Amino acid sequence: TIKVFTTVDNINLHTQVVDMSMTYGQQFGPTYLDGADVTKIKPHNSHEGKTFYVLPNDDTLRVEAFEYYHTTDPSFLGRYMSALNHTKKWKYPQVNGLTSIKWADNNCYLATALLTLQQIELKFNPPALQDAYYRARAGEAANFCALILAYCNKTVGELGDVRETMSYLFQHANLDSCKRVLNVVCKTCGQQQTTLKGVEAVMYMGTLSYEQFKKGVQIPCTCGKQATKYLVQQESPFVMMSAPPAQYELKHGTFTCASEYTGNYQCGHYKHITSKETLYCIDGALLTKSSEYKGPITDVFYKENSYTTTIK
Numbered sequence: 001t002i003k004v005f006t007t008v009d010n011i012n013l014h015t016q017v018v019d020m021s022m023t024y025g026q027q028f029g030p031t032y033l034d035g036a037d038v039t040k041i042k043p044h045n046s047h048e049g050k051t052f053y054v055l056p057n058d059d060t061l062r063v064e065a066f067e068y069y070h071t072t073d074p075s076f077l078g079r080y081m082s083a084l085n086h087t088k089k090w091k092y093p094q095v096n097g098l099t100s101i102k103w104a105d106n107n108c109y110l111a112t113a114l115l116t117l118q119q120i121e122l123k124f125n126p127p128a129l130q131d132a133y134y135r136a137r138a139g140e141a142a143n144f145c146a147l148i149l150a151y152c153n154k155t156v157g158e159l160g161d162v163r164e165t166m167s168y169l170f171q172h173a174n175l176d177s178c179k180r181v182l183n184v185v186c187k188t189c190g191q192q193q194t195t196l197k198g199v200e201a202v203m204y205m206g207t208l209s210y211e212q213f214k215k216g217v218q219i220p221c222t223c224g225k226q227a228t229k230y231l232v233q234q235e236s237p238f239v240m241m242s243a244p245p246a247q248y249e250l251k252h253g254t255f256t257c258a259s260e261y262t263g264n265y266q267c268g269h270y271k272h273i274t275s276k277e278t279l280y281c282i283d284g285a286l287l288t289k290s291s292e293y294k295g296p297i298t299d300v301f302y303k304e305n306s307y308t309t310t311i312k
């Protein structure tokens with residue numbers, strides 16, 4: 001008989017006694033240790049006082065699991081530990097003061113998302129996400145990347161889209177204060193004003209230029225004719241302008257960071273462009289400096305606080 005620790009959040013810990021003759025699965029159910037599944041493994045002398053992750057089997061563990069991860073999905077813990085076993089072996093080099101990822105298992109889109117998150121203001125609602133967010137900013141980004149995969153229902157090696165990944169993450173962050181007021185003007189129907197909140201207030205698909213969104217874009221109307229949609233007010237710490245990959249010029253100082261995508265749809269590669277004192281390009285562990293940039297951009301991130309249009 002050996003005393004061990006079981007947990008669902010590595011915060012609230014529970015002291016259980018274990019027996020050598022029975023595997024961990026017979027006594028606790030699905031059980032993990034640093035990514036390894038010890039469900040089929042019998043306890044060893046080394047497995048003493050160590051902390052084990054277990055699937056929630058009682059109400060205390062079920063409540064603690066939601067308090068930390070904000071999900072009751074029974075597959076979350078398994079999909080999380082399955083990704084963690086990969087992300088712990090990845091390399092996270094410091095590139096231009098930012099934490100990146102050495103390329104492995106098509107993680108280009110994860111590295112681009114991780115680099116973007118270090119440059120925009122965001123507060124995650126699940127304590128698991130926020131804690132790993134902080135640890136990732138310090139350099140230990142293995143747990144954070146595994147959580148991103150779990151929350152996005154993506155597996156290691158699967159090909160991912162940065163805009164879709166950011167969208168999933170935004171829905172797990174506090175964006176209630178974020179407001180976007182738009183106005184569409186039709187020559188026949190008239191003018192109509194709509195107010196967006198939360199994730200819809202920080203993302204737009206159609207154009208890469210925040211300026212063009214302020215000038216107005218052509219959107220078809222209910223009557224069938226092309227109308228003009230322009231930004232009236234914007235109260236958010238940032239905005240994300242997305243468009244299908246097209247050739248675009250990035251000017252130093254006019255944007256925070258951007259996503260470059262080359263290759264065929266769903267099978268291609270992602271690079272990260274950020275606007276420090278000069279334009280930097282981060283391709284995983286690689287770094288190149290240039291004063292100008294023209295290439296296939298699909299996401300552009302801009303800083304914002306409060307904006308009210310001057311058009312009437």
Ligand SMILES: COCn1cc(-c2cc(-c3cnn(C(F)F)c3)cc([C@@H](C)NC(=O)c3cc(OCCN(C)C)ccc3C)c2)cn1
Nearest residue numbers: 159160161162164243244245261263264265266267268298
């Ligand atoms: C030779 O071809 C070149 N080509 C490339 C493109 C192109 C067009 C768009 C786009 C998005 N929106 N639009 C719009 F039409 F709406 C279009 C987006 C991309 C890039 C960013 N993302 C992916 O390619 C991608 C998508 C993924 O999942 C999508 C499925 N979702 C679960 C729904 C998963 C992984 C990756 C890498 C590329 C078009 N032509």
Ligand SMILES: [Cl-]
Nearest residue numbers: 069070071125
């Ligand atoms: Cl929730």
Ligand SMILES: [Cl-]
Nearest residue numbers: 070125126172
């Ligand atoms: Cl949430």
Ligand SMILES: [Cl-]
Nearest residue numbers: 255256302303
């Ligand atoms: Cl900006």
Ligand SMILES: [Cl-]
Nearest residue numbers: 244264265266
């Ligand atoms: Cl398409």
Ligand SMILES: [Zn+2]
Nearest residue numbers: 070125126172
């Ligand atoms: Zn939540």
Ligand SMILES: [Zn+2]
Nearest residue numbers: 085086087089
């Ligand atoms: Zn691996």
Ligand SMILES: [Zn+2]
Nearest residue numbers: 086104105156
């Ligand atoms: Zn791997």
Ligand SMILES: [Zn+2]
Nearest residue numbers: 186189221223
């Ligand atoms: Zn109309």
Ligand SMILES: [Zn+2]
Nearest residue numbers: 106108269270
């Ligand atoms: Zn790649």
